[PDB]
């Protein structure tokens, strides 16, 4: 993203995304069942909005808000999530509709008839990949409570392809040192094009790294089929102190099934179910069969934690990820993605289409410079650290971004089916917390020593 052109077409596919997810709704399902991991759909493109009038409008010229009464009600920080909910505190569909196509035409203005500062564009990047951080997560919300898949989205999966190759294997990466994140703004003059980056890549640095071995697949649905089978959920010797306890919690198994709530003990990953001896997997609003080298999704970090006891491999760090992924060395060239440095939305499953049901053999364009496959797209890969800053770390012009949810959460790397390609890279970095079933996460093993 440089052009002009190009952050405008981001605009309008961005907007279009917001506008297919709430109006392709009823009345009756506008106002969602609660969930601590969803949100109402019409506030969160009122939120997403509000992120241009405060870090682009108001930011550069001294704009006023739309409405300065809702400049309190949009804010992440202050509106609390139980109280989001209200049906007198914030706009209906229309106006809040309303409100996103003026911003957007202010944006487009913007862009179109004010220069292009370095500061700008870093501003128009920021904003834009904001929204879409929030169509992500308007998208599984859907998931979550059940309703029907987003309009935009090919759920029922990459049909043909179906062919698990000979790929599956191992990749043994040699020692040596190693590049690991991104440039610091204050350093570079492409702060705002060809080192862009959110404050949680930055500052860059150089790690000695020990050879590893690392599977060039994704765990596949089954693989961890044998691991239930062999009683994996029964079997405590597998699971951590905090897995244990997160064994042991009475939930709705029911949630988003439109059935009344059953509650109990997790014993499969939450979206599975056996019917009549095969195992079926809750896609949206329907229930459809698990293909077996499709990669497991929407699992948690206990769940994979067990399952590479059980299988005698490991979890990889985020640092071994990212070595496995770009293999950027001190003094070589430079790769953001592991094809490249240029984006084709084409070797990747993300901006919401096959949504996970991929064969994890798949995308061999996306192959990375050891072999690893899939890395970046189908779903979030859990690592084994906890997010943490970079030494040296700066907080961003929005400085609540990655400092609320340190330590607290592990880091997840590579990119969602859910999740749009405009914003990913190597360098990238999620936060998720380990108890977590809703968001759209994987894993793939590690080589023991
Ligand atoms: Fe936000
Ligand atoms: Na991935």
């Known amino acids: 993203m440089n052009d002009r052109e190009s952050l405008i077409q981001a605009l309008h596919h961005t907007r279009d995304r917001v506008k297919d997810l709430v109006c392709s709704l009823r009345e009756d399902q506008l106002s969602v069942p609660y969930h601590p991991g969803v949100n109402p759909p019409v506030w969160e493109m009122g939120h997403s909005t509000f992120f241009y009038e405060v870090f682009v409008l108001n930011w550069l010229d001294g704009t006023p808000s739309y409405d300065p009464s809702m400049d309190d009600l949009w804010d992440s920080f202050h509106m609390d999530h139980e109280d989001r909910w209200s049906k007198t505190l914030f706009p209906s569909r229309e106006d809040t509709l309303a409100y996103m196509d003026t911003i957007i035409q202010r944006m487009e203005d913007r862009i179109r008839n004010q220069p292009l500062t370095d500061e700008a564009l870093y501003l128009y990047r920021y904003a ?21 898949a987003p309009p935009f989205a090919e759920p029922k999966g990459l049909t043909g392809e179906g062919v698990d190759q000979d790929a599956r294997g191992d990749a043994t990466i040699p020692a040596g040192r190693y590049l690991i994140g991104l440039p610091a703004n204050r350093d570079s003059d492409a702060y705002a094009t060809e080192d862009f980056g959110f404050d949680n890549e930055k500052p860059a640095f150089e790690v000695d790294m020990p050879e590893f071995s690392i599977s060039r697949t994704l765990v596949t649905n089954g693989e961890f089929q044998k691991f239930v ?7 405590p010797e597998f699971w951590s102190q905090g897995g244990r306890k997160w064994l042991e919690r009475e939930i709705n198994l029911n949630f988003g099934s439109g059935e009344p709530p059953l509650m109990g003990r997790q014993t499969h990953p939450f979206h599975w179910r056996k019917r009549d001896g095969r195992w079926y997997e809750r896609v949206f609003d329907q229930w459809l069969p698990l293909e077996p080298g499709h990669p497991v999704k929407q699992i948690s970090y206990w769940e994979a934690e067990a399952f590479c006891a059980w299988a005698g491999r490991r979890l990889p760090s985020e640092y071994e990820w990212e070595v496995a992924a770009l293999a950027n060395k001190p003094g070589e060239e430079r ?69 609320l949810q340190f330590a607290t959460h592990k880091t997840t790397k590579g990119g969602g089916c859910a999740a749009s390609s405009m914003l990913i890279r190597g360098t990238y970095r999620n936060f998720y917390h380990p108890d977590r079933c809703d968001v759209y996460t994987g894993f793939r093993t590690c080589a023991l020593s």
């Not at 929204?131 to 309703?147: A, D, I, L, P």
């Not at 996306?366 to 890395?375: A, N």
């Not at 979030?380 to 906890?386: A, H």
Request: one cysteine or more; glycine letters at 10%.
């Open 335 to 403: 790769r953001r993605y592991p094809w490249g440095n240029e984006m084709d939305p084409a070797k990747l499953d993300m901006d919401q289409r096959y949504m996970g049901r991929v064969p994890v053999t798949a995308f061999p364009a996306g192959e990375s410079p050891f072999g690893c496959r899939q890395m970046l797209g189908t779903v979030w890969e859990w690592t084994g650290n906890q997010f943490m800053p970079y030494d040296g770390f700066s907080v961003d012009m929005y400085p609540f971004y990655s400092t």
């Open 229 to 235: 089978e062999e009683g994996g959920y029964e079997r």
């Open 128 to 148: 834009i990949y904001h929204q879409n951080m929030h169509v992500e997560s308007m998208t599984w919300c859907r998931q979550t409570v059940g309703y029907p």
